[PDB]
Amino acid sequence: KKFLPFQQFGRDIDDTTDAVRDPQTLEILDITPCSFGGVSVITPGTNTSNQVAVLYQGVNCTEVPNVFQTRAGCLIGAEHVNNSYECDIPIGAGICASYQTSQSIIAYTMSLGAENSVAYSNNSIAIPINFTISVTTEILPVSMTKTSVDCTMYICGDSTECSNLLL
Amino acid sequence: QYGSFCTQLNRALTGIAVEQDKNTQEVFAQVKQIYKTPPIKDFGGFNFSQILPDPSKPSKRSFIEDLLFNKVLICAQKFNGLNVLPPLLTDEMIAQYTSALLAGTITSGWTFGAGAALQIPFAMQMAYRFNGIGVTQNVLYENQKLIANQFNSAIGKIQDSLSSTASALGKLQDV
Amino acid sequence: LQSLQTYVTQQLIRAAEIRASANLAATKMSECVLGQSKRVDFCGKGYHLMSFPQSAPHGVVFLHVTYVPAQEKNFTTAPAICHDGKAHFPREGVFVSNGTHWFVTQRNFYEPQIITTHNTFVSGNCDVVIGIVNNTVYDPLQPELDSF
Amino acid sequence: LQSLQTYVTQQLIRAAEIRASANLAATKMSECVLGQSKRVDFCGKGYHLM
Numbered sequence: 001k002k003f004l005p006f007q008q009f010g011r012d013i014d015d016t017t018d019a020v021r022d023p024q025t026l027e028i029l030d031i032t033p034c035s036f037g038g039v040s041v042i043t044p045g046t047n048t049s050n051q052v053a054v055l056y057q058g059v060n061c062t063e064v065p066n067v068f069q070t071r072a073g074c075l076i077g078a079e080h081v082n083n084s085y086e087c088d089i090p091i092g093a094g095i096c097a098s099y100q101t102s103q104s105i106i107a108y109t110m111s112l113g114a115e116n117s118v119a120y121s122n123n124s125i126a127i128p129i130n131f132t133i134s135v136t137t138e139i140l141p142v143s144m145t146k147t148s149v150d151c152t153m154y155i156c157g158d159s160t161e162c163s164n165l166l167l
Numbered sequence: 168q169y170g171s172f173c174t175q176l177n178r179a180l181t182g183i184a185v186e187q188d189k190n191t192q193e194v195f196a197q198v199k200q201i202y203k204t205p206p207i208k209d210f211g212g213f214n215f216s217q218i219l220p221d222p223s224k225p226s227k228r229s230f231i232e233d234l235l236f237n238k239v240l241i242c243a244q245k246f247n248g249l250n251v252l253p254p255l256l257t258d259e260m261i262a263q264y265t266s267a268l269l270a271g272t273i274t275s276g277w278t279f280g281a282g283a284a285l286q287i288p289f290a291m292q293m294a295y296r297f298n299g300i301g302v303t304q305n306v307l308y309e310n311q312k313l314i315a316n317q318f319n320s321a322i323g324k325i326q327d328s329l330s331s332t333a334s335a336l337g338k339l340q341d342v
Numbered sequence: 343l344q345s346l347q348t349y350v351t352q353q354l355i356r357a358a359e360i361r362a363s364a365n366l367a368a369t370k371m372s373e374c375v376l377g378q379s380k381r382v383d384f385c386g387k388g389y390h391l392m393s394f395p396q397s398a399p400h401g402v403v404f405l406h407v408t409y410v411p412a413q414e415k416n417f418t419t420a421p422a423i424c425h426d427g428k429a430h431f432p433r434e435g436v437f438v439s440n441g442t443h444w445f446v447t448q449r450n451f452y453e454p455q456i457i458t459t460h461n462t463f464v465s466g467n468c469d470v471v472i473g474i475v476n477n478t479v480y481d482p483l484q485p486e487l488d489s490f
Numbered sequence: 491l492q493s494l495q496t497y498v499t500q501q502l503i504r505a506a507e508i509r510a511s512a513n514l515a516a517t518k519m520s521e522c523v524l525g526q527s528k529r530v531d532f533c534g535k536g537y538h539l540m
């Protein structure tokens with residue numbers, strides 16, 4: 001990007017410094033903040049095992065120090081598996097991790113359920129013959145716990161000075 | 168010295184993120200087995216070609232979906248620890264549920280929401296969908312070809328309605 | 343003061359999440375329990391029969407009783423039937439066949455029957471509908487007169 | 491800290507307007523799509539077919 005003869009350094013819509021002009025040689029440089037991210041830990045139950053898989057989010061694997069590059073980021077400590085299964089511990093952008101073959105933490109592309117096809121035709125009706133009765137169940141919260149909190153005892157430890165300052 | 172303020176914020180925002188994932192899961196994953204339409208399109212005379220997915224395309228997104236997606240920075244705000252996590256379901260998986268619900272609706276009617284899919288000729292299905300709003304079955308068959316034209320023409324205008332002005336998608340564009 | 347204000351605000355938001363689940367339960371408790379609901383996938387998963395509420399600590403638990411079909415058998419069909427020019431339609435059911443004869447059944451339980459005039463209603467002539475098939479329609483009112 | 495706390499609160503509220511639309515879309519996809527409705531003016535304007 002080429003500035004004007006006098007204009008020194010640029011900004012963005014949110015007035016953050018983006019470019020700059022070198023003093024000694026009139027050359028134009030771009031500033032990009034050096035990377036950050038949120039370290040995360042994928043683990044099965046402590047009772048089940050003590051192997052964990054670390055996930056750096058939005059960090060290229062080259063700058064991080066088994067690896068794998070997922071759209072979510074870099075994931076070290078887990079093995080990619082071509083086979084696809086139901087999701088166990090979701091990660092990001094369609095990748096699920098689980099604990100099964102000893103066993104190791106496997107990361108895989110999530111499977112959108114099974115696959116099925118039906119035979120539509122000009123003249124084909126399937127009419128069921130037998131039936132079964134089932135019993136489902138679901139739970140709905142109704143009321144949380146009633147509570148009450150008086151201010152003057154919380155803020156002030158029952159002293160005249162604090163009670164007369166809060167007034 | 169300001170105590171545990173950051174932790175509250177991070178807990179709240181993580182709750183929001185998990186909630187968004189559960190929202191999409193609940194809205195779309197109403198079906199358990201992914202169906203798909205037969206290779207032939209003898210649907211009694213209805214041109215479903217706009218809404219069914221088109222193979223001659225990089226993604227499996229159908230025509231109307233493509234129009235909508237065309238109808239509707241990253242590091243600019245990102246300088247200051249404002250990361251944006253990616254959604255769990257990718258925009259291709261979402262377009263896979265939808266192509267199932269369309270496939271199941273056309274070939275099975277509604278009986279695929281209770282048990283498993285049951286084959287039913289489409290021309291016989293709408294006869295049952297009328298029969299639930301009062302008009303007897305004889306109205307459909309006696310005027311089958313007429314309704315096909317109105318229905319096919321109806322999808323004609325909506326495609327032009329979206330591709331005319333950008334004020335049709337006001338609700339998402341606000342978000 | 344800031345510490346207490348933040349806690350109060352969160353409660354107001356959280357107490358409005360529950361208020362939308364004590365209204366979706368006070369509704370399921372009405373259609374599901376005190377009646378039979380036709381709202382698909384509202385009460386249970388499948389065709390709905392009844393419900394049974396139960397209590398719980400700060401909540402409620404339902405036990406929906408649901409009806410689902412089991413075995414599907416393929417059959418051939420036809421959206422009408424022509425006997426003497428006049429088309430014949432099922433009053434309530436599909437037309438089904440097993441290769442030799444035709445039968446009329448219910449939508450959700452295979453139970454064949456004889457195609458008589460007692461359960462079909464005529465409409466128009468049979469050169470307009472598509473997919474109609476030739477067949478006979480038995481008449482129940484003939485034999486008793488013949489008996490006399 | 492005030493400004494950061496303001497943005498969070500706005501999110502918490504605004505992220506509950508959506509939760510009242512996901513639980514509404516998730517309904518219409520269960521009556522209108524997977525079945526036929528009788529709720530007048532729920533699945534379209536008029537008698538609903540599919």
Ligand SMILES: *[C@@H]1O[C@H](CO)[C@@H](O)[C@H](O)[C@H]1NC(C)=O
Nearest residue numbers: 005021022023024025026027
């Ligand atoms: C600074 O000095 C160097 C070396 O003499 C020269 O090449 C460069 O052009 C000078 N730049 C300016 C700003 O005068």
Ligand SMILES: *[C@@H]1O[C@H](CO)[C@@H](O)[C@H](O)[C@H]1NC(C)=O
Nearest residue numbers: 044045046047048049050099
């Ligand atoms: C630990 O896991 C084993 C096997 O799943 C189970 O039998 C046992 O009850 C669990 N104990 C814990 C962690 O409470």
Ligand SMILES: *[C@@H]1O[C@H](CO)[C@@H](O)[C@H](O)[C@H]1NC(C)=O
Nearest residue numbers: 059060061062063069070073
């Ligand atoms: C990671 O870094 C290498 C070297 O800079 C680069 O070639 C590659 O494209 C980068 N990959 C990602 C995910 O940005």
Ligand SMILES: *[C@@H]1O[C@H](CO)[C@@H](O)[C@H](O)[C@H]1NC(C)=O
Nearest residue numbers: 068069080081082083108109
């Ligand atoms: C497994 O997945 C990787 C990454 O997509 C691919 O390169 C490889 O060919 C796949 N292998 C098999 C056995 O499908």
Ligand SMILES: *[C@@H]1O[C@H](CO)[C@@H](O)[C@H](O)[C@H]1NC(C)=O
Nearest residue numbers: 120121122123207208209473
């Ligand atoms: C039945 O459907 C097939 C395509 O699946 C078609 O070729 C055939 O002509 C149709 N027959 C009738 C009865 O229309």
Ligand SMILES: *[C@@H]1O[C@H](CO)[C@@H](O)[C@H](O)[C@H]1NC(C)=O
Nearest residue numbers: 119124126413414415416417
């Ligand atoms: C119905 O016919 C189709 C095509 O021949 C077949 O795939 C399917 O298994 C049959 N279903 C039953 C249960 O007869």
